[PDB]
Every structure is written in C-alpha cells, then in structure tokens.
C-alpha cells in the first residue's frame, strides 16, 4: 500500500561540480608504486551532479535515467539514505532490483515488484520515551515471481535524529557490465553543513552481483522523521561515461590520485606520457579529447522482401550434380523471418560473422541449392575433400559467404 | 530450468572432481573456451556459476561466443570474451515424454537482441504490425513465449539437450573451488616447480613483508613478472623470483 505525500513544495534543483569523486578499483590484483592506465565507465571530473536536499517541507525523489553507470553520494547525519531501486518500467512488467537497509538487516531483491511514485521509510518518535523505532516501510505494493534474494547479517543502527551539520559522506558506484552489477563504495567522516568536500576517493569493490537484466531507470529511497517532516538530508547523483583514467598507486596498495585523459591538455600530456610529472618542452599528444555520442545509418532506399521463401521452400529442389544458382536483387534480407519456422543444423559462415550479418549490404548474392546425405555436410566447406567436393560441387579456397544446411528427411525422402 | 529464465547456482568451498562426472554420464559436446580440458585439473577456480537450460538438438551450436539465432539473441547470449566450459549431453529419455513435454518455453519474438548474460522474464505482448495490441491478443499480436514440442519419436534435432554452461575467472581474487590435485610439501629458498593456487612456473621463492588487501590474493609489481602470491596452506606472504640471477 502506498499514498501520496501532501504539503509538497516545488523548488528547482541545483547543479554542482564533483571535485575528483567517483573513481574505483578496476581490478582485484595487488600492485604498488606503479601507474596504471585503464578504460572503463567513469564519471568525468568537474561534472554536473544533482544537488538534491531536504530541510520548508522540501522532499524529493524523482525517477532518473540510468545511462550505463550511476555515481551516488550522500551527506548523512541520522541515517536517511536507506537504499535504491533500479529497473526498466518499475510497474512489475520488467525485472526490478531493490536495495534497502531496513530496521535490522540489508535486503537486496531482484524481483518483479510494483512501485508507487513516492516510496518512503517512516521513523516514528515518541514523547514519553526518547527511543526512536522504525515503524513504516512502503517501497513495493506487492510481490511476484522472485528471481534473486539476499539478506545480510543482522545489526542495529543509530536511529536517533542528530542536529547540526552532517557528519558522514557515503559514496557508491553502480555499473552493469557483461551481465554483472558491480557496486563500489567507501565512507568518510566529514564536517560540513551544505557542501561537497574537496577530497579524493578510493572506492573499494563490495559486490559483483550476477543479475544480468535490462536497466534504464533509477530512484532513491528516503527516510522521514497527514502531517510529517522531512529532516536534514542531502545527496548527489551523477552519471558515468566511457573515459580513460591513469591511477597512481601508493606503497600501501591504495591509490593516491587519478589524472583525467580528456579534461586538460596538461592531463593529455600526462596520459600520453603515462606519468604525473612532465618537464618543459613540446609534447605531441595522442587524441583522447572527443568521444562521439550519435550514430547514423544510410542504406539503399528499397524495402522489398527477398525471395527466401522460394529458395528455402522450393518444393522441387535441385540435385548435387546439376545445382541451381539463383540471383537475388533489389530487396532486403530479413534473417529474422527465416528461423521462425525453420531450424538450421549447421549455419557455418566463412568470412562474415553471423553477429555483424544484419548491418551489412550485399552486392552480388547467389543461392546454391543441392541435396546431400548427412555424412557429406562437412564436405561443403573450403578445403574439404570427398566424392562431393571433388566430383560434384567444389567451394573456392577464398570463399566469402554462409553455408546454411538443415534436415529434410520428411520432405526429400519417401518410402521405397 | 527453462531457457528464457535460466538458473545460476553459485558453487563455493569445495573441490571439483571431474573424474566423477563421466563415470555414469556421457557428454556430447564438452566445448571449452579459454581453458584447455587437459589443464583443467591443476587449476583452482575463484568465481564459478552453473547455467542451466534445455534446448533442442539443432540449437546446441548457438550456445557459443559469436553464434546467432533465436537462442543466442532472444533467449541466452554468451559474452565475446568468455572464459569457461560448455557441457551438453542428450536428455531425450529424461526431459521428453509421450504426448509432448510443453513445460519448456522460449522467446520466439523479441524487440531487440539480448546483452551478454542478460535474462528476460517479461511476458508482455509483442506487436508484429503497426497496429497497437493494447495488451489483448489479436491480429499481428502473438504471445512471445512459444512451447517446445519434445517427443521421444522425433529425430536428433528435435530432442532435448541439457546444457550446463560454467563461467570462471582464472588467477584473479581468492579462490574457493579447486581441482582434484593433491597438495605436497613446500621447499622454499630452492629452485622448484610451483603450482600455487593454479599458478604454474619455475623459480625460487623467498619471504616478503608487504601486506595485501583483504580482497586481493595475487600481486604483480610489474606485469608479466608475477612476483607476489600468498601460500594457501600457511597464509604466509611471499615473493616469486626467477630461478637464478641473470648477472653471469
């Protein structure tokens, strides 16, 4: 069950720059006193992050796009940030991920939950006793067919509401690479009331969850102390981009500083010489400045269907000693239609990979056609021999094409 | 498990005895990517996962890095830089019964190709034409999950083939699943062939004093040297140096 929250005040959010935050360890192998260059999804230095904060009655938790990597930061005083939700549609139609820190444990659930617009954790405070006890928890309306579940070690927190300036800074990095959801984090005590501190961060790896789901939507849970109050909280959301860093490792195995390779010409020289100190002179720089963000596709402007139905169901189908060559022209080759009703045994492709077959445009295409027995399917290949590839049908050594074979015991063979 | 929603099981804190498996089970295609089958025994693996799905005989080739089809674009895609072994065998007697086994399903139609190791469980209606289906079946509106028709009277292409795909990560992070090789004594300060946690080589070892991180188990001060390693038996931090100094 969920309900709309009243007395909501609308104010435009602020944008501030992150002073060298959001970098993590790319690998778990130990090194020391060396400089390592890496290419991974990283938040670029001095980028706009979203200053979201509470107190009048300032409450905010919008739905943000994921955009292949999210860096999160939070200035914490009295345990307001409790978790996040990730997904695609957030309405139990797609797979969803939920990370929450409830009153005694930490729960990570990958399931098809249905979500309301304003999820919250409600903490209630009593006049008669000074103890703060968790009372309310509304993030999902109901449950469905669950896939992954994880419950941490039980513990207790500081549930009281401290006053004054914030005392902690907890940083997180979420990314999804090769079906793996990698979470990096570190927490540093701070003394600030409304500021993002100027200090380097070394986010250690925490979990590599093997979830492997589509993800494009993100939202942050909050805790509040139909009257209600929001309390004091502030968090920061930024997005990771494909960049190149150079990390300097100290003698203790922890990283010291990271030199961007696409921010400054001095940083460009530091990247192209792979060192943090450069002398005077002229240093030609390798090109790391620009990364394209758009794609354009232009093809011949004809959308007829190719006669694959004539080739693949030919009812009378050619022999092997006198095979048929059919020219295909002025149409489109929709491969997705072919395997709807036909199963191919050996889809061997020479010179062209099957993955990059869709985006190509063919110029001189011909469709050979013959019937062979099951033992001679291997003979239709460049470099094979036998009584089929020597006397009946020989393929060239520099072949470029795809061999498509299937079973036709029901069609091409009859009794007697 | 089915192929649209396959199962991932984590295996940890045990030993992987390969010799038990082929005592009573015969594997059709033991394709291995990145790791040779001969050197599988002396390795000790770190992060393993056992995928599980049933496919027909013609689509066994589709579970491979770089292959395409309706099982490697819409159901289960393997990454390009895969490191592991694909274990498939015939299961016509177990997974197929008379009258058709309709429990197994697969995504016949999908809007876009899957990312590597990504699971899709949604059952939303796919629109074939430009008309909107609006969540109800009609013309050019089909259920995306079609059912297999496994029957014991069909051919080799139309019978189930249980596929278990293992994914490893060799010689990075601490390891929990090792091979069936037996451990021997350690001869330090002498030239000897070592097999520390699957890392084979020849060179002398001494005692080092640097401290590792809790999530780090190996170390290479300079790459292609492999100087640092921890002894699994004693948890003594050491160093790996070449057999003799080169200054002769």
């Amino acid at each position, epitope marked *: 069950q969920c309900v709309n929250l009243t007395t909501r005040t609308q104010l435009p959010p602020a944008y501030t720059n992150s002073f060298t935050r959001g970098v993590y360890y790319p690998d778990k192998v130990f090194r020391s006193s060396v400089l390592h260059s890496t290419q991974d999804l990283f938040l670029p230095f001095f980028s706009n992050v979203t200053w979201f904060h509470a107190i009048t009655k300032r409450f905010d938790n919008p739905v943000l796009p994921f955009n292949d990597g999210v860096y999160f930061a939070s200035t*914490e005083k009295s*345990n307001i940030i409790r978790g996040w939700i990730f997904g695609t549609t957030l309405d139990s139609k797609t797979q969803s991920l939920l990370i929450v*820190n409830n009153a*005694t444990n*930490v729960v990570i659930k990958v399931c098809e939950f249905q979500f309301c617009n304003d999820p919250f954790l409600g903490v209630y405070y009593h006049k008669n006793n*000074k*103890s*703060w*006890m968790e009372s309310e928890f509304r993030v999902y309306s109901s449950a469905n067919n669950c896939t992954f579940e994880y419950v*941490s*070690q*039980p*513990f*207790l*927190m*500081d*549930l*009281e509401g401290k006053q004054g300036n914030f*005392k*902690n800074l*907890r940083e997180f990095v979420f990314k999804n690479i090769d079906g793996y959801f990698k979470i990096y*984090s570190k*927490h540093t*005590p701070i003394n600030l009331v409304r500021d993002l501190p100027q200090g380097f961060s070394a986010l*250690e790896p*925490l*979990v590599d969850l093997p979830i492997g789901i589509n993800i494009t939507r993100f939202q942050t849970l909050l805790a509040l102390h139909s009257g209600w109050t929001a309390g004091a909280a502030a968090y920061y959301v930024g997005y990771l981009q494909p960049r190149t860093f150079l990390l300097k490792y100290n003698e203790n195995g922890t990283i010291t500083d990271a030199v961007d390779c696409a921010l400054d010409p001095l940083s460009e020289t530091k990247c192209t010489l792979k060192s943090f100190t450069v002398e005077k002179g002229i240093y030609q720089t390798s090109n790391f400045r620009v990364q394209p963000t758009e794609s354009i596709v232009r093809f011949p402007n004809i959308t007829n269907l190719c006669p694959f139905g004539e080739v693949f169901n030919a009812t009378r189908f050619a022999s092997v000693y006198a095979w048929n060559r059919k020219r295909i022209s002025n149409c489109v080759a929709d491969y997705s239609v072919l395997y709807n009703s036909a199963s191919f045994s050996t889809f061997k492709c020479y010179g062209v990979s099957p993955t990059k077959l869709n985006d190509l445009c063919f110029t001189n295409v011909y469709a050979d056609s013959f019937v062979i027995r099951g033992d001679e399917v291997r003979q239709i290949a460049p470099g094979q021999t036998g009584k089929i590839a020597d006397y009946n049908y020989k393929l060239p050594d520099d072949f470029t094409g795809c061999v498509i074979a299937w079973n036709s015991n029901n069609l091409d063979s009859k009794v007697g | 498990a089915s192929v649209y929603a396959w199962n991932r099981k984590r295996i940890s804190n045990c030993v992987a005895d390969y010799s038990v498996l082929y005592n009573s089970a015969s594997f059709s295609t033991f394709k291995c990517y990145g790791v040779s089958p001969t050197k599988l025994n002396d390795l000790c693996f770190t992060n393993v996962y056992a995928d599980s799905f049933v496919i027909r005989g013609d689509e066994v080739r589709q579970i491979a890095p770089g292959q395409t089809g309706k099982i490697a674009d819409y159901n289960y895609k393997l990454p390009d830089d895969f490191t592991g072994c694909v274990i498939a065998w015939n299961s016509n007697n177990l997974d197929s019964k008379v009258g058709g086994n309709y429990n197994y399903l697969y995504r016949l139609f999908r809007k876009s190709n899957l990312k590597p190791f990504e699971r899709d469980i949604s059952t939303e209606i796919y629109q074939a034409g430009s008309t909107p289906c609006n969540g109800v079946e009609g013309f050019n509106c089909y259920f995306p999950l079609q059912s297999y028709g496994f029957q014991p009277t069909n051919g080799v292409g139309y019978q189930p083939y249980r596929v278990v795909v293992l994914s490893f990560e060799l010689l990075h992070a601490p390891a929990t699943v090792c091979g069936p090789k037996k451990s021997t004594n350690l001869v330090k300060n002498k030239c000897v062939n070592f097999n520390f946690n699957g890392l084979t080589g020849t060179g002398v070892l001494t005692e080092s004093n640097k401290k590792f991180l*809790p*999530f780090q188990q190996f170390g290479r001060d300079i790459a292609d040297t492999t100087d640092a390693v921890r002894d699994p038996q004693t948890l003594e931090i050491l160093d790996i140096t070449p057999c003799s100094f080169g200054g002769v």
Partner: antibody
Amino acid sequence: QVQLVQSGAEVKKPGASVKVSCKASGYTFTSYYMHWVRQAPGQGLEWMGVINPSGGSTSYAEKFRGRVTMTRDTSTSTVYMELSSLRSEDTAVYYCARDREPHSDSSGYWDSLKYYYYYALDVWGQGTTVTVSS
Amino acid sequence: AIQLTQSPSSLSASVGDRVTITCRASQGISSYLAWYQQKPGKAPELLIYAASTLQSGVPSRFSGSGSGTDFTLTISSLQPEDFATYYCQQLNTYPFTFGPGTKVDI
C-alpha cells in the same frame, strides 16, 4: 584493566518491575553492543538482549519480546534493564557483557557485505542475583 | 530456532592428558562459533572466537576446529585449573543460543 560493576541483590514480590544497572568502566560507552545474559541456578546460559548504546536501539530475544525494557543513561554512563511480570522461573543471576565487534558513529552497516561480523562476549561483569518468591 | 548439542554430557579425565569435546549444530552455521569457559562460582570468559582463532591473553594449549554442523575443542596438557564448564554458541541468526554444558572432574 576495565572494571564493570552491577547493582546489588534485590528481593521483591514477583508482580512488579525490577531495576538492574550496569556501569562499564574503561571503555567507550557508545562503541560495543552491551549484551545481556541470564543464568538460572543449575542451568546453562541464555541470551536475552543486545544494546546498541549510541543508537539506543535494542534487540530482544523472540521468547522475551515485549516484556523487557532495555534502556541507557549516557549522562551517568550506565545501562539499565527492567523486567515486567516476574515469574518463579525468573529467579536467576544476570550478567551484562560487551561484545567484541567495535563500531563507529556511522552506518558502515553498508559494509556488512564486505567484512563478515563475528560478535564475541569477551568482558563479563561479576553479575547480580535476582530472587523473587511469593 | 537453532539448537546446539554437546556430547558427551558427562566427562571424566585426568591431569596432563589430551581430551576432545564436540558439539553438533542443526543447520548451517559456517564459522560463527564462540567457545566459552566458565569456572564454577565465577563469571564466564571468552576462550575461542570464530572456531579456529585463539583469543588474546589465552595460552595456546587450547585449540578449536570444525565446520558446517560439527564443531570440536581439543585440550592438550590439561592444567588443574582447566576443570570448568564449556559452552559452544552459534551466531548465525537471532536469537543467539548457548550449549547445554559439559562438566569435567579430576
């Protein structure tokens, strides 16, 4: 070394509340949890509650939930325990023991997934004797 | 809940020998174990934490081992001051439960 002093022996009718106090000395009051152990005469130990002193948050056993109030006084630096509806089987001795795991004034409980938590009752008090009878 | 059973309930030994005591768990506990020693008329003291690690300020004659549902404690060169009650405690989930207790006599 640290010295922990509990309250004296108290006798009362088993139909009212009891007041037990502990006062750890030589250790940061807020860091470690303050575990509570009841021992019956001629019986083994049992765990009844844990106190996160800085938070004031507490966790009871599932058998004794809702009948025991476990509070703190950080101004006078003591841990208080009160039990309602005493029975004849509650005639026992009470120990209040700190737990080994230390913490800071922060929810690094996020790091529960990095480092495993092992709790150990290393330092024990001298105990108090609570005897009730009709 | 989770219950732990120590076997045997009654133990008899001498001074200067090696003795072995064990306790069996119901479900999976992994490495969450506390071995506690309590002298009669005295408060209990922590002896072994995490089932394989010696606690500081304790002599190394005591040792502990075990995994899964089985746990054991080995006593070598048994001093006359070691005649005390032993408990094994599991810390998997709430609530934390103690063992029954083993008594050893001269």
